[PDB]
Amino acid sequence: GTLKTSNLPEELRKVFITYSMD
Amino acid sequence: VREPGSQACLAIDPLVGEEGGAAVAKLEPHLQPRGQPAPQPLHTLVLA
Numbered sequence: 001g002t003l004k005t006s007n008l009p010e011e012l013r014k015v016f017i018t019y020s021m022d
Numbered sequence: 023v024r025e026p027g028s029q030a031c032l033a034i035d036p037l038v039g040e041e042g043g044a045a046v047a048k049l050e051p052h053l054q055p056r057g058q059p060a061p062q063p064l065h066t067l068v069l070a
Contacts, residue, residue, distance in 0.1 A: 001047075003052075004049070
């Protein structure tokens, strides 16, 4: 296929994860 | 009596553009493989 690249600014690259011990 | 020659009914058929239509495209992200030497979390221990 053909390749594509996202313009996602670094500010939108931040992620937060919440979980439990198991 | 009258003849339908001039007034004949009309059928219809669309001029479909499917022959020249673009296709739907599926995207797949090229994962940075861990099979290749990708980095790992540096779980640290202390030698006391």
